[PDB]
# Entry
Amino acid sequence: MAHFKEYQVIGRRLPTESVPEPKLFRMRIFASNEVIAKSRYWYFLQKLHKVKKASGEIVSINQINEAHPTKVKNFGVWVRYDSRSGTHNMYKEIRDVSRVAAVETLYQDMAARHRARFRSIHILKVAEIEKTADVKRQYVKQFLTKDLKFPLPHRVQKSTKTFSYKRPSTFY
Amino acid sequence: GIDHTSKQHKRSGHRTAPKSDNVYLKLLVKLYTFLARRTDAPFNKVVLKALFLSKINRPPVSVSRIARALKQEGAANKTVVVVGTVTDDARIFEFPKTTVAALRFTAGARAKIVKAGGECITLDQLAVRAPKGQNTLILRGPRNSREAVRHFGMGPHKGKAPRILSTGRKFERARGRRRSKGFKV
Amino acid sequence: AKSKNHTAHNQTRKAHRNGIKKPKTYKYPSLKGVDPKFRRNHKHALHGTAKALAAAKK
Amino acid sequence: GKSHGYRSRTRYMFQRDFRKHGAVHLSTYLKVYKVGDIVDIKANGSIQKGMPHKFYQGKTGVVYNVTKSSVGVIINKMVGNRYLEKRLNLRVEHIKHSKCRQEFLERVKANAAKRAEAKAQGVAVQLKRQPAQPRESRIVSTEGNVPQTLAPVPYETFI
Amino acid sequence: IIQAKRDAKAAGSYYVEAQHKLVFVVRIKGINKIPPKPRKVLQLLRLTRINSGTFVKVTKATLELLKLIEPYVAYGYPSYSTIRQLVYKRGFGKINKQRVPLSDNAIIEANLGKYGILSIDDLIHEIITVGPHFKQANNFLWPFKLSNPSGGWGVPRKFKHFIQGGSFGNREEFINKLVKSMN
RNA sequence: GGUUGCGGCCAUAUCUACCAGAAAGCACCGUUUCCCGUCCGAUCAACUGUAGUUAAGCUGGUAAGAGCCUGACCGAGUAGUGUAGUGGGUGACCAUACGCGAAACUCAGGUGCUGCAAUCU
RNA sequence: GCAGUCAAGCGUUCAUAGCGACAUUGCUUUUUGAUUCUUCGAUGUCGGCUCUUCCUAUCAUACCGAAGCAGAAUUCGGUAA
RNA sequence: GAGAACAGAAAUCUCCAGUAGAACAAAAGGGUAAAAGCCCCCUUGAUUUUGAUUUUCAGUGUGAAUACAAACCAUGAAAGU
RNA sequence: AAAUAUGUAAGAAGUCCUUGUUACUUAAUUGAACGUGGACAUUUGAAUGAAGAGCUUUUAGUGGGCCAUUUUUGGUAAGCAGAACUGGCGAUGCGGGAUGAACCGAACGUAGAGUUAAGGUGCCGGAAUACACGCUCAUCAGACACCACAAAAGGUGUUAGUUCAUCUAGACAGCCGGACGGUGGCCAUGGAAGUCGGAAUCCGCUAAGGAGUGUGUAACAACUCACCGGCCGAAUGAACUAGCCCUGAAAAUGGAUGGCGCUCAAGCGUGUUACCUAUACUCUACCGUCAGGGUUGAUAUGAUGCCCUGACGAGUAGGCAGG
RNA sequence: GGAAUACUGCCAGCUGGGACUGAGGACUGCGACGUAAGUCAAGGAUGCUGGCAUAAUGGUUAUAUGCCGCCCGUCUUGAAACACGGACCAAGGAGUCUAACGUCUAUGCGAGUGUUUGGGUGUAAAACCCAUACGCGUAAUGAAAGUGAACGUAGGUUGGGG
RNA sequence: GAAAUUGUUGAAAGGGAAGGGCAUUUGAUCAGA
Ligand SMILES: [K+]
Ligand SMILES: [Mg+2]
Ligand SMILES: [Mg+2]
Ligand SMILES: [Mg+2]
Ligand SMILES: [Mg+2]
Ligand SMILES: [Mg+2]
Ligand SMILES: [Mg+2]
Ligand SMILES: [Mg+2]
Ligand SMILES: [Mg+2]
Ligand SMILES: [Mg+2]
Ligand SMILES: [Mg+2]
Ligand SMILES: [Mg+2]
Ligand SMILES: [Mg+2]
Ligand SMILES: [Mg+2]
Ligand SMILES: [Mg+2]
Ligand SMILES: [Mg+2]
Ligand SMILES: [Mg+2]
Ligand SMILES: [Mg+2]
Ligand SMILES: [Mg+2]
Ligand SMILES: [Mg+2]
Ligand SMILES: [Mg+2]
Ligand SMILES: [Mg+2]
Ligand SMILES: [Mg+2]
Ligand SMILES: [Mg+2]
Ligand SMILES: [Mg+2]
Ligand SMILES: [Mg+2]
Ligand SMILES: [Mg+2]
Ligand SMILES: [Mg+2]
Ligand SMILES: [Mg+2]
Ligand SMILES: [Mg+2]
Ligand SMILES: [Mg+2]
Ligand SMILES: [Mg+2]
Ligand SMILES: [Mg+2]
Ligand SMILES: [Mg+2]
Ligand SMILES: [Mg+2]
Ligand SMILES: [Mg+2]
Ligand SMILES: [Mg+2]
Ligand SMILES: [Mg+2]
Ligand SMILES: [Mg+2]
Ligand SMILES: [Mg+2]
# Structure
């Protein structure tokens, strides 16, 4: 729904006299802020366990920063989404420097290719593929060849002015 | 836009001056406006309000009513204040000596009070004697005794005096007024 | 020509303009439907209580 | 044509609470009703005399009269834009004592006791009920309770 | 609070901060086409005009009111800075109801001094810490008449929930930024 | 603790199939002059408490018993549903947000409790 | 009224050259209904004659594809008014 | 369901099971099992007086109904009805 | 057996203690009702609000309604006909939806400034030919809810996925070689040899071959394929799923994403900012209305006056007031 | 292991530019600074300066330009309507008066009230004056015959302004 | 000796109506200190 941050959200299923110290369930939620993070936490906990916001509590919320924000990684992403006619599971691969950037790319890509809005997508799993040759999508694999170089043909520079006096060039 | 919780520009619904154009009544209202503003006297405030009242809201107070009010325990020496007309009553035979301040006195009422040995004063004389309404006793006539009142709220099983011009047999007494003709009320 | 038959449309708005009024509770409510035997004896009990309370001022 | 009888549309309302048909138990008749008692009306379909109209099913009122087998109940019926006083003559099988005020009476007694013990022990009253307050801070331990990480489950049909 | 959080983390526990006792609620919806129950709740919270705001002491009885009026209000947890700026700039008191600006501490003392509130900072304190006389101090405060936000609402459409990219509902800590831009 | 008389709640008390029951009580059981009622002293009435019996009633126990009752993060926060959007979808319908929240199912447990009076190994 | 989709069958064999049951999706407003929104201080109410234009769901003419097209004739279909 | 001459599917006699699967004037719904059903006994409360109340409702009328009061009765051992 | 909706209660007309009346009631000063006297005001017993609350009289107009979401009945359906709750229109302008009674936003005294709503920012036209990731090329592209339509069924168009398979012990495609024997397998048939049919789906040689995938004959024959090999050398096949696009897709004057026009968009999905502007919001001024107040202590003539303070201002039918 | 920085939030931190506004009209207040005097940005604009001294500003009017603006009245759920009336203008043109009444208000008198049928009188339809009646009210109720309003401090209880 | 309607003169505007609102240019005209 915006530029994403990843939050660990831990909730409780609030204690009673019968059950003190309940079982402290945790989730990694990609959300643009903490209100949405906690909302998504309760949404998925209600999908998983007999609990709701009114019968539980948020024990903790903590943003998780990328441990290595400046190393390029290949992420495998497993999602579950609703199409116009059904629900489907999908696996994709995204090359980027952080989980939040990978997830933002994934949401953009789901919207672009499957018209799957945010509300229709569940992030099942995001995991860095530590070993290349376990990358199984060609659109990522092509970026892992040795000494990868490519030109950027047909450069289009934007003019600051309405009129130009030169009949410009697209060389690069 | 504002979601008004009440009627906007609603008038208070109370008189702030007499409808009367009596210049003397307006002078009394001026005096008691001054007093009510600058005395902190509940008596002065209620007398100022009473000076605005219409005629049917100022029912006459009879000397009988005054005598009963004075027979009240401890009231025998209080000055009786009637914002309205004091009327005479021949049904009483022993009127007490008292001071009565009233807007108007009937000839017979003034005569009875003075013959009993009291005084009939005006409301400005009352204001001079008791600017805070000391030792006063405000009397009010029987408002809900007007002939018009007995027709108010007419309806089935109300018992409220139909509006009628001629009374007697043949005049609104047969069907709807007895069980032998259809039903009763 | 047929017309509309019935609707409660606007009725609650009309009723709430002057508001639904609670019926002005009173102490000493009327004894209208009360058992006439109880009422007959209550009159005598009250007359006796009044006489006693009057005589009790000596 | 249309049909609005006295017991129209009462088919389920006046039924006998399945496997609770038959004779009315004796506590219903052993109950004692005084003028001023607050009663809930629930018609017993097996007692066709002294039966309330369907409007008064689930209504709560005040006993104003007591007769041989019945009580007079005062209900405030909403008609038009105001309330009208209705006086029903209901047999005791159609009314029960209301517990809408037992909590109030118990609070009254506890409040008197607390006020007495307070003006005997010190100075504090706190006699007004309070709404459920926001929770206070707490420390939640992980000893034996290390957080388990859940993830959304993939779709499947299991049909 | 900071030290308790650090100590719980150092002890391997989680410090669950206390639930918020005070909310600020701003009516973000106009006065047309409001269903009767939300409209009555708005009138009882004194939000009778768009961009009017009030402080609400959080209980069950008031949380169930906020629940009803959620699509018409943005609310959240006000900070001390937000409350202080609200009372300083847009603080008005009810004296013969007379919407009197809180320009001097004498007015606050004359109307709330019987509760121990002698100054505008006494009032702010009784608001931020929900004191024994919060009801009287908050009712003495005239509903705050805020402007539209100065940098916009931050969203293209206001009338979906804050969680769904809109403006209404609980925006818990971002109410401070919204109210600061509205003040 | 058993039993009777009167009971309260009216199955955790009911139903089916077996087994056990000391004391007392209850019961079956014996009789037909009287009161009474019957086609029939079977029921009902009366008399005896004597001739007999725990066979039955009754009480309790047993049963991976039927039913019933209780509870549950069991199913299920599912179905449904209040509120919201210039959400999706041609539509049928659906997703999401803020709330409320079943029934079936599954499992575990249980199988009358008790008031007044009298009486009893 | 016109047109699709599926394809059990017809077509000596062969589902689809040409057809096509049981179903099912549509389109059109040259049928007739349904409605009563406009017109009852009045829009002249059948048909024909005359004349112009428009549509294409094409009868013919042009050029074509298909056939259970040898020729001839015909049939199905495309661009086409 | 199990039995008894004529007598069988239907006659009358007997036992067992039987929560109502019958009956209660009529339409339907509700209600009812030592009864509200069936049979028997006695009866006229289907009476008198004039109020209150509920539904329809304007809180008018009419119809119907509810609970009392004041009498006279019926029934039952009685409470009661 | 919900959700929503709904009755009642949350106190001084209360609670507790004692004891007077009665012709009612009890076996009974038993009880019932009403009292006398005595005790209990910081929270007098939840929350929030309260331009106050209560009460009365008297009259106008109206008594054709319609629309939207949701619930819902009849009907194939309807801009149809009928109900429920709410909100609207009527009775209402204003910004937006080009246009439009009802939709969105917001309701209106006269002005100024600022900020916004909904909606927009290529040009018309105020406002980024903004930024970012993708998708789409339509010889009928598409382009913002109400709303001014399109479906089933299809497409090696293109994109992204799911699952199952083959593959250096050599896969797919391609070219070439083999594709037999028992055997004219059994039955029938007028004839039927793998191939008009029913049934049986065997065995050997086998690297491999179906009692046969098709063409063919009257039956033959003869070609051909499953199946296995030769060549090549790294990937490949099948069935599904759903995005955009295309086919499906035919009407009458010439015409409508509003127009122009737009194709790494000015289209579609999504994300982030900046910006534009309503009679809305904020502040101020002025007009009026209402409310609360001050001021008869004098020269002082407008106390129905003068003055202070706060709030408000839509309007048909209609009422009233001041002119 | 030690930092930095981002992000978010706070400051009764400092400070530059731009726009609109200047209501009020002796003093009174709350403050600030100052040792105190006094001063101040503290209950609303002052100071300095220039040009003009009239069509210059402004008003009015015609026109032009930008954007907007359907024909009123009427019935109607809905009118600019392809609904009706209206070619134009002047003058006329439609809730009146009366008998009897309801509510409310003003006035006079008040258990009474109403002089004006009539009489007297007059400066002559005026004004002024007046007897007896009569009307309404002071008593209701019943079909009627008829009867007819204090147990009491004209009652008790609860609330009740003063 | 009004208006409708009309002549003349003067002024002004005028691509399939005219009229109107806000604002200002221009021309004409004018009060106030
Ligand atoms: K016509
Ligand atoms: Mg009608
Ligand atoms: Mg029920
Ligand atoms: Mg800005
Ligand atoms: Mg917006
Ligand atoms: Mg025997
Ligand atoms: Mg016997
Ligand atoms: Mg035995
Ligand atoms: Mg069992
Ligand atoms: Mg909406
Ligand atoms: Mg119609
Ligand atoms: Mg004509
Ligand atoms: Mg014509
Ligand atoms: Mg064609
Ligand atoms: Mg019986
Ligand atoms: Mg009837
Ligand atoms: Mg009409
Ligand atoms: Mg109308
Ligand atoms: Mg509107
Ligand atoms: Mg449009
Ligand atoms: Mg522009
Ligand atoms: Mg499709
Ligand atoms: Mg052959
Ligand atoms: Mg298309
Ligand atoms: Mg555009
Ligand atoms: Mg986009
Ligand atoms: Mg403005
Ligand atoms: Mg005033
Ligand atoms: Mg107005
Ligand atoms: Mg910063
Ligand atoms: Mg000028
Ligand atoms: Mg226009
Ligand atoms: Mg019409
Ligand atoms: Mg019109
Ligand atoms: Mg038309
Ligand atoms: Mg006409
Ligand atoms: Mg005409
Ligand atoms: Mg005229
Ligand atoms: Mg002349
Ligand atoms: Mg002329």
